[PDB]
Structure formats: structure tokens, C-alpha cells
């Protein structure tokens, strides 16, 4: 359609994949986490789950006090849960012509190259392979210009969003990289372009 509320849909999809809301808690997402144990998680000022990727064994042990299978699952989630990075590359920042097929290359990356793209959770039993959503839209207007989904089995690749540029003057474009699988990995990067 072109409607930027696609973002909301994407967010929802993450919830479905996992089984928890976008606002509720990033930390409850992890396979076999609970509010009792989330008391001790907020103790160490853990906002994002990327904090759990940088933590080490002793702390982890202190935190979780459960059976081994659950622990293993958690570990798996952590490992295949990737720290991705967002960098774009425009062809011609001078020659911005309105109403033209303006291709824009986007080189993306992961933390660790996936052994497989096996999405894990607890509450969603049926197996899923991880997908991503590259997005481009004007935030105030809510008009989505460029979208593509990807299956990132390399550690780093380049993807081109064959999009049509907006009308004349300034346009404050913004990008996302929403994992359809996992909550709270919404990497973004806004920028300007002046069109004639």
C-alpha cells in the first residue's frame, strides 16, 4: 500500500514469534525468563538484551538458577540473537532527482555468522527461520518508500532498495532493521536529502 504503520505490524510479528509485547519487557523475551528473576536482572541496570551478550559466566550463574535444558536454550537464543549494524550508501547525494528510480545500496552486518538461522523461543512451538526487514520512510507523513526482507546467512552483505525518491525540497528519511523474529533489535539511522 505504502503505509508506514508497517513498522507496527513488524513489531507485532516479533511478539507473535516470541510471545510478549514491544513495551512490556525486552528482558522477558529470553526462553524461560520470569518476573521473580527479572528483579535480579534490573539490579545490574540491564536495559537491552545485548547486555547479556557482553556478560560472563559467574554473573550468569548468579542470575539464573534453573535446569540445564532451559539454560542451554537461553544460551542458544543469546548466540543466534545477533548484534547487527546499520550502514547505508547513496549513489549521488548531489544529483537527487524527484520521481526517479533511485537505487540505494545498504551494507549490513552481524555479530557472529549464523550456524543456522533457527529462531528460538518458548511459547511459540512451531519452528521458524529468522528474517529481517529493511525499511525506509518519512516519519511525519508516514509514507514508506523502500522495503525489503532478507535472510542473512553470511556475516555481512549488501542489499539495494530500488525506491522512488520523494517530491522537491528537504526530506528527513529514516531506516529500520526490524528482525521479524526477535524483539528489541530495531537498528535505525535518520538522514536528509534535498531534491529538485
Dihedral sign for Cα 153, 157, 162, 165, please: positive
Specify the CATH class of 23-82 in words: mainly alpha
Q: Distance from CA of residue 149 to its chain's centroid?
A: 12
Architecture of domain 83-196: Sandwich (2.60)
Q: In what order do the strands lie in the sheet with 156-160?
A: 85-90, 104-109, 156-160
Calpha distance 123→4 (Å, rounded)? 29
C-alpha cell belonging to residue 171: 526530506
The x, y and z cell numbers of residue 103, run together, are 537505487
Instruction: Give the method used.
Output: cryo-EM
CA 67, 117, 153, 52: dihedral to nearest 10 degrees?
-40
**C-alpha–C-alpha distance, residues 104 and 119, integer Å:** 29
Q: After which residue numbers is the chain interrupted with C–N beyond 2.5 angstroms?
A: none
Backbone torsion region of residue 187, taken as left when φ is above 0, otherwise alpha when ψ lies between -120 and 50, otherwise beta: beta
Which residues are CB-neighbours of 51 under 8 A, at least 6 positions away? 44
Query: What's the chain look like in SS3?
Result: CCECCHHHHHHHHHHHHHCCCCCCCCCCCCCCCCHHHHHHHHCCCCCCCHHHHHCCHHHHHHHCCCCHHHHHHHHHHHHHCCCCEEEEEECCCCCCCCCCEECEEEEEECCCCCCCCEECCCCCCCCEECCEEEEEEECCCCEEEEEEEECCCCCEEEEECCEECCCCEEEEEEEEEEECCCCCCCCCEEEEEEEC
Nearest by Cα to 195 from 168, 163, 165: 168
Q: Which of 99, 113, 163 is nearest to 134 (CA)?
A: 163
Nearest CA among 34, 33, 37 for reference residue 78? 33
Q: Resolution of the coordinates in A? A: 4.2
Cell matching residue 52: 547479556
Amino acid at each position: 500500500n505504502g503505509y508506514l504503520n508497517a513498522t507496527t505490524a513488524m513489531d507485532l510479528a516479533q511478539m507473535l514469534i516470541q510471545g510478549v509485547w514491544d513495551v512490556d519487557n525486552p528482558l522477558r523475551q529470553i526462553p524461560h525468563f520470569n518476573n521473580k528473576i527479572l528483579e535480579k536482572c534490573k539490579e545490574i541496570n540491564v536495559e537491552t538484551v545485548y547486555d547479556i551478550m557482553a556478560l560472563e559466566d559467574e554473573e550468569r550463574d548468579e542470575i539464573l538458577t534453573l535446569t540445564d535444558s532451559q539454560l542451554a536454550q537461553v544460551a542458544a537464543f543469546v548466540n543466534n540473537y545477533p548484534n547487527v549494524e546499520l550502514t547505508y550508501s547513496l549513489n549521488n547525494s548531489d544529483s537527487l532527482i524527484s520521481g526517479v528510480k533511485q537505487k540505494i545500496t545498504i551494507q549490513l552486518t552481524r555479530d557472529v555468522e549464523p550456524e543456522n538461522l533457527q529462531v528460538t523461543s518458548e511459547k511459540y512451538p512451531f519452528d521458524k527461520l529468522e528474517s529481517w526487514w529493511l525499511v525506509l520512510g518519512e516519519v511525519s507523513k508516514k509514507e514508506l518508500y523502500a522495503i525489503k526482507k532478507v535472510t542473512l546467512n553470511k556475516e555481512t552483505q549488501q542489499y539495494e532498495l530500488e525506491f522512488d525518491t520523494p517530491t522537491s525540497g528537504k526530506h528527513n528519511l529514516t531506516i529500520w532493521c526490524v528482525c521479524d523474529s526477535y524483539l528489541d533489535a530495531d537498528k535505525e539511522l535518520s538522514f536528509e536529502i534535498n531534491v529538485k
